[PDB]
Swiss-Prot record, chain A:
Signal peptide positions on this chain: none
The protein, known as: HTH-type transcriptional regulator RutR
InterPro entries in the cross-refs: Homeodomain-like_sf, HTH-type_TetR-like_transc_reg, HTH_TetR, Tet_transcr_reg_TetR-rel_C_sf, Tscrpt_reg_pyr_util_RutR, Tscrpt_reg_YcdC_C
Keywords, alphabetical: DNA-binding, Repressor, Transcription, Transcription regulation
Subunit structure: Homodimer.
Keyword Repressor set for record: yes
Lineage, uppermost ranks: Bacteria, Pseudomonadati, Pseudomonadota, Gammaproteobacteria, Enterobacterales
Function in brief: Master transcription regulator which represses the degradation of pyrimidines (rutABCDEFG) and purines (gcl operon) for maintenance of metabolic balance between pyrimidines and purines. It also regulates the synthesis of pyrimidine nucleotides and arginine from glutamine (carAB) and the supply of glutamate (gadABWX).
Gene3D superfamilies registered for this protein in UniProt: Homeodomain-like (1.10.10.60), Tetracycline Repressor, domain 2 (1.10.357.10)
């Protein structure tokens, strides 16, 4: 309900993200996050009672940003338009918050020791629901027959790649997503491949 | 050489678990059944050994793409590449994860391999695939992005295995799920690049 409280939380989460990125979970101290955020350590602990709780909150915030378009899917949407928009929003996040994408990737590489409950609970429940929705679209003949979970994974993988594998992308192409021309070429290619791959025939 | 393979295999398992800075050459030598002196004969530094491990997964990954020739059937060639890449994610997930960790770090040790030999290969094979596009044997796509989608989509199933399992109950070590994954990744990419 409180905007001032919400802003303070965001400031702490933003400092935590940037710190957990430069130094890792075990290397990060709460005193470093508080200092970067301009808050007392006691104020930080009021909101996030441990380093573990704060780290999980940073990762839940990235999931929130990433999943917002998919959560919004309704049976009523134009499927190919909705999926196009989803791919574009995902690439914008890789362009704008690459450090979040990398932190999430690092937690996955570690076997999701702190995030596993969020994956098996709330994420699984969401993907189950939207998979049924997408399957309805297939039944209706609005999409070619594909397994929805694999479509979803393809979208995640293809768009996150440009953040997580940025040094390789740059080595190969000379560009990153912060080059506006390259950004646009990327969107156009990822969208064409996925959309023409699921368009009904 | 059987010794060199033992050292590389021990190194992969150790690095992929503990990271570069956390790994000791004494641990790798012990696992490989060699002295640290004998290890250093083959690999004169931890950096050299790490780079060797990462060049080996590059070699395995790139073999199908290196084989591409102008006169191949393009959709068939790409379809086969996707399958072979998923076989690698099933069989060598630790190597995929180690390579991903090196990328997340900004490729501090691997960057020269990426800007040198990798770039040269991708330039040659991008020209080849662009010739296929020019000829109307593929849809109007940009080859580098098609290549990146293949790498991303196939490597995802190793690198993000915890999430794939949390969501689906499966991994690529489950035969039904592996077959399903190949079928679906192939269908999306191949139908997305088929000329219309
Ligand atoms: O967009 C998403 C959502 C969940 N997990 C991912 O890897 N990406
Ligand atoms: O298959 C490959 C080859 C190079 N780099 C990757 O990420 N994947």
């Amino acid at each position: 309900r409180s905007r001032a409280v919400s802003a303070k939380k965001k400031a702490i989460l933003s400092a935590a993200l940037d710190t957990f990125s430069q130094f890792g979970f075990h290397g990060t101290r709460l005193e470093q996050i508080a200092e970067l955020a301009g808050v007392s350590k006691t104020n930080l602990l009021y909101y996030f009672p441990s380093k573990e709780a704060l780290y999980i909150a940073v990762l839940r915030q990235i999931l929130d940003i990433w999943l917002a378009p998919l959560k919004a899917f309704r049976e009523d949407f134009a499927p190919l338009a909705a999926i196009k928009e989803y791919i574009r929003l995902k690439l914008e996040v890789s362009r704008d918050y690459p450090q979040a994408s990398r932190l999430f990737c690092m937690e996955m590489l570690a076997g999701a020791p702190l995030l596993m409950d969020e994956l098996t609970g709330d994420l699984k429940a969401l993907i189950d629901e939207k998979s049924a929705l997408i399957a309805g679209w297939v039944k209706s003949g609005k999409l070619a027959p594909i397994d929805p979970q694999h479509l979803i994974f393809m979208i995640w993988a293809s768009t996150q790649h440009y953040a997580d594998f940025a040094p390789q992308v740059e080595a190969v192409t000379g560009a990153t997503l912060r080059d506006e021309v390259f950004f646009n070429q990327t969107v156009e290619n990822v969208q064409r491949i996925i959309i023409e791959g699921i368009r009904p025939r």
